[PDB]
Amino acid sequence: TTGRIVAVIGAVVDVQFDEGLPPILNALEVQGRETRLVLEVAQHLGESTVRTIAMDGTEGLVRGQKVLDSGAPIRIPVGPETLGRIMNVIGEPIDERGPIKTKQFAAIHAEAPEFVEMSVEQEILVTGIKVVDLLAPYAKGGKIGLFGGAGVGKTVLIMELINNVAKAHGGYSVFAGVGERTREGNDLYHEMIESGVINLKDATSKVALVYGQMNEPPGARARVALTGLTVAEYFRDQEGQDVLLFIDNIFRFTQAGSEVSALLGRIPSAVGYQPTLATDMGTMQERITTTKKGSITSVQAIYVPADDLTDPAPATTFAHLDATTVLSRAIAELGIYPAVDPLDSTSRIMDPNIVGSEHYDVARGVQKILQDYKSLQDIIAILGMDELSEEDKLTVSRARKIQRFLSQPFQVAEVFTGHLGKLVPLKETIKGFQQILAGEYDHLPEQAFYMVGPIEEAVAKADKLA
């Protein structure tokens, strides 16, 4: 049907329909504008009025302008031809590469999987990267917190994860940029084409890009994380894949939703956040789980404010986080890539009951041997290297060979590095580290384990010349 603009206040618009009203969350098309404008129904104010939140600039609006109900929520293209495409919150292709011709369109809102459709199985999504799979394993259909931004190759780690899931599990990925800086959007775009994941020619693309840029109103920043989730939801249920969902960054999704609740006029909760914070997080984070058909596993980049972990934003996010991946400057400056902190990254599935009996003792052994190394660091610098006992000399030399074997060259980075990329299978990693702990390579040098795939390529490298 049709409705008229009764009120325009900032990014909040009110529309009066005569007859039937659009249910809450139905998209509204404002007619006669230059581009497309979407208004999302948030409330029913009574007297046949609705309160809507815009996804684009509300300048040039006339009171009385005809607004069209789309009869459904914000519907977006879903299907294989959304891969290698930059999407925005309302489905529109923003890569100037011609309209996305998908058979199906799906609404960005939808209820979380029923209790019956849940997966009672806890499984591990093997990433191919050693540091991850051994020490901080990703839960298949779980949620992972990525700490630390760029300057350590965040973008790379993401791309390699996209490559390796598409490789090992035959599952596509979706990048949802919440509050994407337009410079960083452009920069991330070409970085994905130059490395191989986005293919501008054929159909071999592995990612779908959705951009909620910063220069877009709070409505667009608060809902784009759904527009990305819905493109990912197609590949879970319709093609039965183990999907991968990137949100960067999750805090700007929380701040996006705080702005909306602040705009509608809701009394703010603690620390200035929205009263709906718990649910505002729940109604989205509960769509990301393992179903009967497939699974979506989400990597989320987190910003903690005032480095305060008790701050409600990270506190509400942590209730949903199954594993963490800390990208650190310190480890990156030593030369270990990926720049993952082996002791700082923790996982819920680090349990003999979930991964297995072997996986657990090998991971913990590696965890202990690196803590011991740190525990002897002051004794190393200020005592005299040659005065450690046999068991203290040995664990030091063994520990150094462990953190080097964490290092792994990346496929995505063949264009830069020039060296061959590696996908290390799960059991290859477990046994590889177990042997170094057992001392089976006490004779091999340190430089042997650096930037190698499995343990085989390390012993072969140990030969070199002499």
Partner: protein
């Protein structure tokens, strides 16, 4: 006929107060559209409501009374734009306020335009030189980038921006046209005397000729201070969209945030953290994304942004600062301690960061910057034991002596920006160890004498570093011979 009142295109003031006019009628007004009161004043329709329109007054609200006729004149809120503005001190809307007559402006641009998309942009790689060693080597800025000046009051925030403007004279008087940079300084909510002290300091540098000064001072009304950043932005975009280069400095965004807040609170929009409306992040996000580097497809021009944020008690976790930190590509943190301790510019090497960084600085600077980044990093870890370390190992004792001397090199006085080639030379001396035997206090005088000499006698060498864009093995040896023998003679 009688008392008809054209409620469609006109109306009357129902209630005026606090720069807010509630107007009856105006049934055809668009949101954010300029209006005109009886008295000749301007105003904006920021609130469209069922029974009224809330208009923010562009001026003194004494002149508006109840029942004053409010007229639509189909106004497009746009500012004069183009090279005719360079050298002038215009107001928040482009009007001249430097008493030098009208501006011969021909092109005129809207203040509420959208930022460029993802596509027409290319990666930031061209250098933007501040002439400040500390910056260009540790927190490097490039064309199309956004970098935040952020510290407490009187920490040297404006000086960083100031020295950058003066630095451009070098490029703007030469032949290399691509490397030219046009300056736009926006005073938002400042006092007129400080804004007068400013333009004089730019005149004395002969920097004004290439500087557009957009000014909305504290006496100028709330909406005037709200548009002033965007009004400058449009002026900078002209150059950007026409293959040229422009640098804008919003001084400051904390004061525009106050000027916006007033209006919302008085238009009665919901208050949030620190009484700020929901769209104040959105106020700055659309302003600062407007700065970009275009590809050769779109002329290849660039606009470069420099927001200033004032923090109280160093709190960078305040709502507005938290906004702008994430908005931008990087920050430079200035601290009170560093200031009075002596380290000026008081740039905190630790916290300060640029994402573009490495790819923005010339291949010459790259050659000595990352080394300095690593060495000052290892210095700051041990910095606390600079005196309480008689029995420390000779390793950390070198890393302390290396750091203190580099810290002295990054020191700088105001108003004397350095060319990219002059910078690498004085940084080459300390980074390659050729100052590790000189007594800390003597460094600043050496820099002054050593720089005075290389310009006066080895013009070809510095010129080669500029030409080649890098320090070749030839130049490397040529620099080593000058430093070793000049330093030896120095200590004689």
């Amino acid at each position: 006929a009688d008392t008809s009142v054209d409620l469609e295109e006109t109306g009357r003031v129902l209630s005026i107060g606090d720069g807010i006019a509630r107007v009856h009628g105006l049934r055809n007004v668009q949101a954010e559209e300029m209006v005109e009161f009886s008295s000749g004043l301007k105003g904006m329709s920021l609130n469209l409501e069922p029974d009224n329109v809330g208009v923010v007054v562009f001026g003194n609200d004494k002149l508006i009374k109840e029942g004053d006729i409010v007229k639509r004149t189909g106004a497009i809120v746009d500012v004069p734009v183009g090279e005719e503005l360079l050298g002038r001190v215009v107001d928040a809307l482009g009007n001249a306020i430097d008493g030098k007559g009208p501006i011969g402006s021909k092109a005129r641009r809207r203040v509420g335009l959208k930022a460029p998309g993802i596509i027409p942009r290319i990666s930031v790689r061209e250098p933007m030189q501040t002439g400040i060693k500390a910056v260009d080597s540790l927190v490097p800025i490039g064309r199309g980038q956004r970098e935040l000046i952020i510290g407490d009051r009187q920490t040297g925030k404006t000086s960083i921006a100031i020295d950058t403007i003066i630095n451009q004279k070098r490029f703007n008087d030469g032949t290399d046209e691509k490397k030219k940079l046009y300056c736009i300084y926006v005073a938002i909510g400042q006092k007129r005397s400080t804004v007068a002290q400013l333009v004089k300091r730019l005149t004395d540098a002969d920097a004004m000729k290439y500087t557009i000064v957009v000014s909305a001072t504290a006496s100028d009304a709330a909406p005037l201070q709200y548009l002033a950043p965007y009004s400058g932005c449009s002026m900078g975009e002209y150059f950007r969209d026409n293959g040229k280069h422009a640098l804008i400095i919003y001084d400051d965004l904390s004061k525009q945030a106050v000027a916006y807040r007033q209006m919302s609170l008085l238009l009665r929009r919901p208050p949030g953290r620190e009484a700020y409306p929901g769209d104040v992040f959105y106020l700055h996000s659309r302003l600062l994304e407007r700065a970009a580097k275009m590809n050769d497809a779109f002329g290849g021009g660039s606009l470069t942004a420099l927001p200033v944020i004032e923090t109280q008690a160093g709190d960078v976790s305040a709502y507005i600062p938290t906004n702008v930190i994430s908005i931008t590509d990087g920050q430079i943190f200035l601290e009170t301690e560093l200031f009075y301790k002596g380290i000026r510019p008081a740039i905190n090497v630790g916290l300060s960061v640029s994402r573009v960084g490495s790819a923005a600085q010339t291949r010459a600077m790259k050659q000595v910057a990352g080394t300095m980044k690593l060495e000052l990093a290892q210095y700051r870890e041990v910095a606390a034991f600079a005196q309480f370390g008689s029995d420390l190992d000779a390793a950390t004792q070198q890393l302390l002596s290396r750091g203190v001397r580099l810290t002295e090199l990054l020191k700088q006085g105001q108003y004397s920006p350095m060319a990219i080639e002059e910078q690498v030379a004085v940084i080459y001396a300390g980074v390659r160890g050729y100052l590790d035997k000189l007594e800390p206090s003597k460094i600043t005088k050496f820099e002054n004498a050593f720089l005075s000499h290389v310009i006066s006698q080895h013009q070809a060498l510095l010129g080669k570093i500029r030409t080649d864009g890098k320090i070749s093995e030839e130049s490397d040896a040529k620099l080593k011979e000058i430093v070793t023998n000049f330093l030896a003679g120095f200590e004689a």
